[PDB]
């Protein structure tokens, strides 16, 4: 299955996605994150 | 005087500073730019 949209996987053979993690760009600043497109490998961080 | 918070100016000689442009990054969404210190030359998304 394609992993679902705030979800990613790397690894080929897997067997669950693993939900998009926050996006730490400093000293206690979380940024969530989300990918684009349905079936993806990569997180953006969502407000942009 | 240096440039407001949300402002920018990057000539030297300049008689009023500039408000940061939103990120234009497809059809109908803007992403508004803020500014990291207060005399700065170049603005950044301000989500992150």
Do not use: H, I, M
Request: with cysteine; glycine share 10%.
């Amino acid at each position: 299955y394609k992993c679902p949209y705030d979800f990613f996987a790397d690894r080929p053979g897997v067997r669950q996605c693993t939900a998009c993690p926050p996006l730490d760009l400093g000293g206690g600043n979380l940024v969530e994150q989300c990918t684009e497109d349905l079936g993806s490998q990569r997180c953006k961080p969502c407000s942009l």
